[PDB]
């Protein structure tokens, strides 16, 4: 039932119910010859929605908003981007066009600027050192340390025990580390442990790319990082 690269053309988006008031969004994108899939999150708060990550580009993010408005029928009022790469901030200008208040960590804004990528407008201050946590509407935003990138954050929804691990967590089938050009492989194991120790009751763990699983995904990531 979970969408993969094989059932979504580039330029379409799909939503998938994870629990009460929680969906993942799934999109696709081609770099050169390779097509990938990518996951974000949608969390209901009263009569509004908080978006976690873009759908990897402006065309995908417009379609994300259209799918959200079809399937759910509530406005996206704020967004959070979980690191600086295009699959997280790519399409932030689409969000701003639509009146969305876009947030990320200060480091993510600096790194995104340095990479020539779109930059969320507002900083989540108080997310500066490994271990920092802030509450944000219906979720916690946790900065566990460097791993996939120096700035990567995870988002936990406590009501329903859902952890969006983003690109710091690999899916079950993935056996290679991936894009490690911004990675901190030395620190990635300690970062994962901080996540495991913080969210031991998580029922679902969603990676940045691929299929969701449980908490087994965290140690699987430590194994893949070697
Ligand atoms: Mg870019
Ligand atoms: Zn990335
Ligand atoms: Zn990614």
Swiss-Prot record:
Gene3D superfamilies for the chain: Ribonuclease Z/Hydroxyacylglutathione hydrolase-like
Any single Gene Ontology cellular-component annotation: periplasmic space
Gene Ontology molecular-function annotations: beta-lactamase activity; zinc ion binding
Biological classification of the source: Bacteria, Pseudomonadati, Pseudomonadota, Gammaproteobacteria, Pseudomonadales
Extra facts: The class B beta-lactamase family has a specific amino-acid numbering system known as BBL, for standard numbering of class B beta-lactamases. A multiple sequence alignment was used to derive a consensus sequence and then the consensus was numbered taking into account insertions and deletions. This allows use of identical numbers, e.g. for active site residues, despite differences in protein length. UniProt always uses natural numbering of residues, hence there appear to be differences in numbering between this entry and some papers.
UniProt xrefs under InterPro entries: Beta-lactamase_class-B_CS, Metallo-B-lactamas, NDM-1-like, RibonucZ/Hydroxyglut_hydro
Localization: Periplasm
Positions annotated to bind Zn(2+) 1: 83, 85, 148
A GO BP annotation: antibiotic catabolic process
Cofactor names: Zn(2+)
Protein name, per record: Metallo-beta-lactamase VIM-7
Pfam families: Lactamase_B
Family, per entry: Belongs to the metallo-beta-lactamase superfamily. Class-B beta-lactamase family.
Residues at which Zn(2+) 2 binds: 87, 167, 209
Reactions listed under catalytic activity: a beta-lactam + H2O = a substituted beta-amino acid
Complex formation: Monomer.
Species this chain originates from: Pseudomonas aeruginosa
Keywords from the UniProt entry: Antibiotic resistance, Hydrolase, Metal-binding, Periplasm, Plasmid, Signal, Zinc
SMART domains documented for this protein: Lactamase_B
UniProt-listed PANTHER family: ACYL-COENZYME A THIOESTERASE MBLAC2, METALLO-BETA-LACTAMASE DOMAIN-CONTAINING
Coiled-coil regions listed in the entry: none
Principal location class: periplasm
Functional description taken from the UniProt entry: Class B beta-lactamase which confers resistance to the beta-lactam antibiotics, including penicillins, cephalosporins and carbapenems. Acts via hydrolysis of the beta-lactam ring. Has penicillin-, cephalosporin- and carbapenem-hydrolyzing activities.
EC number per UniProt: 3.5.2.6
